[PDB]
Amino acid sequence: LPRAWADTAWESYKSRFMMADGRIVDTGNGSVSHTEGQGFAMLLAVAKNDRPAFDKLWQWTDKTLRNKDNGLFYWRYNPVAPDPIADKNDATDGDTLIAWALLRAQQQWGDKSYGIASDAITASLLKSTVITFAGHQVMLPGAKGFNRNDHVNLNPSYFIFPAWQAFAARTHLTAWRKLQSDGKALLGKMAWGKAQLPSDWVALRADGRMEPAKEWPPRMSYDAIRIPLYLSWADPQSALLTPWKSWFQSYPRLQTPAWVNVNTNDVAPWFMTGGLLAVRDLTTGEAQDDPQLSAQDDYYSASLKMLVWLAKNDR
């Protein structure tokens, strides 16, 4: 019944989630914004050759969320709070996506200020959020509060390899190359339960012992599911996709659990649809139609749809 041949996925996306001030708004959860959302929107905006949207999104991000102390970004903005940025700390996937977007901006429109801005974020990322723990280089989920004592709490879904690839190519720095290599090494050792899958949050101990972090439910759920998105995006024949192809293969396309507990092997009471399913089809190589965004899609699902589309597009 929906006859909207003249609408596009990207315009629908702007219509649903983009405020005129440059804000991406998660209308599902209290009209909040965040650097992941901004970063996501900026990549799409470049790929869609939408410079006014990119310029608006960036301008708002930089004016509103730039942490001048370290050059990163206060990660969440809550317009309906006395302090709309109570959490004065960054999320490194968000930082990454922004810098990555700016880089691709430079490539798309040649404006060198983009690359410059990008450069300064990635140097800030290197300065404040990358460290040596165990025998490896790691990027903490944030400059503050993730390095504990005997361990660090990591989120492997923050390991944005295709960005890192781009950082390494533009800057030529070895830091970005080793960060990929060590990240690919660690991730590979991050398998648990019958699934042998990554949890959203992982604790890495100085001895290199890794564990689904105590403080969150030990699930492959709303974060971890992004890993194969990033993996396939950076190398569709990546050997790290294997645990994921194996797991998807283990379920019927329309009855794949939305998440799995990797400690107890228990699974979610509902099945992947929309965005998550777009991720599955990406991992398994099952042909996907260009994203059609319906009202039945919430903020995350519509986003996954578009990102999966863009990961496909980079070939």
Side-chain angles (χ1 to χ4, degrees), residues 262-292:
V262 305
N263 272 3
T264 78
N265 282 313
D266 296 327
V267 302
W270 82 95
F271 296 134
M272 292 185 169
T273 59
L276 299 177
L277 192 72
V279 166
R280 168 184 213 271
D281 289 350
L282 185 60
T283 324
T284 64
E286 173 77 64
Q288 260 170 278
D289 218 328
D290 269 332
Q292 266 107 53

Side-chain angles (χ1 to χ4, degrees), residues 119-159:
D119 288 348
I121 294 153
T122 52
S124 316
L125 277 167
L126 289 188
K127 188 195 194 65
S128 320
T129 72
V130 175
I131 70 167
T132 318
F133 205 84
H136 301 125
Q137 297 298 292
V138 297
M139 167 177 294
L140 302 162
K144 235 167 269 199
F146 286 100
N147 184 9
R148 279 326 209 191
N149 310 120
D150 50 322
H151 66 119
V152 295
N153 292 328
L154 296 181
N155 192 312
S157 83
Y158 289 26
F159 299 178

Side-chain angles (χ1 to χ4, degrees), residues 73-279:
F73 301 97
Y74 295 129
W75 84 268
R76 188 182 180 255
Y77 179 87
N78 187 1
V80 286
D83 190 12
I85 308 171
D87 187 19
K88 291 230 154 31
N89 188 22
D90 68 310
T92 43
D93 52 356
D95 303 309
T96 301
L97 296 153
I98 293 168
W100 191 20
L102 291 167
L103 178 151
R104 292 159 73 95
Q106 192 266 335
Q107 304 191 287
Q108 191 65 254
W109 298 303
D111 193 333
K112 75 183 164 53
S113 63
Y114 291 138
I116 289 170
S118 167
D119 288 348
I121 294 153
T122 52
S124 316
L125 277 167
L126 289 188
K127 188 195 194 65
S128 320
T129 72
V130 175
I131 70 167
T132 318
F133 205 84
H136 301 125
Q137 297 298 292
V138 297
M139 167 177 294
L140 302 162
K144 235 167 269 199
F146 286 100
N147 184 9
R148 279 326 209 191
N149 310 120
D150 50 322
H151 66 119
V152 295
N153 292 328
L154 296 181
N155 192 312
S157 83
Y158 289 26
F159 299 178
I160 310 183
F161 305 101
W164 295 2
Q165 248 167 14
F167 299 164
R170 181 186 162 83
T171 72
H172 294 258
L173 291 173
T174 69
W176 286 112
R177 279 175 209 146
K178 185 175 170 60
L179 199 68
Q180 297 182 67
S181 193
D182 284 15
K184 286 185 193 156
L186 281 167
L187 178 64
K189 301 178 191 171
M190 293 175 184
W192 293 281
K194 289 208 106 186
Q196 294 296 274
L197 288 178
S199 51
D200 301 320
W201 289 95
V202 173
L204 160 62
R205 200 181 295 194
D207 47 28
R209 153 180 21 202
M210 289 187 282
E211 243 175 284
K214 276 205 201 66
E215 307 84 324
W216 300 259
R219 282 165 189 161
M220 195 301 290
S221 73
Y222 52 75
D223 268 354
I225 194 51
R226 293 198 289 284
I227 295 162
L229 161 65
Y230 294 140
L231 280 175
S232 161
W233 187 333
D235 178 10
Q237 75 172 259
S238 164
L240 282 171
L241 287 169
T242 276
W244 306 95
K245 309 200 53 149
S246 161
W247 186 68
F248 283 130
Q249 277 174 356
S250 144
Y251 294 104
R253 176 168 193 277
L254 288 199
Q255 334 179 54
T256 308
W259 54 248
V260 44
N261 189 303
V262 305
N263 272 3
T264 78
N265 282 313
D266 296 327
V267 302
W270 82 95
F271 296 134
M272 292 185 169
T273 59
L276 299 177
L277 192 72
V279 166

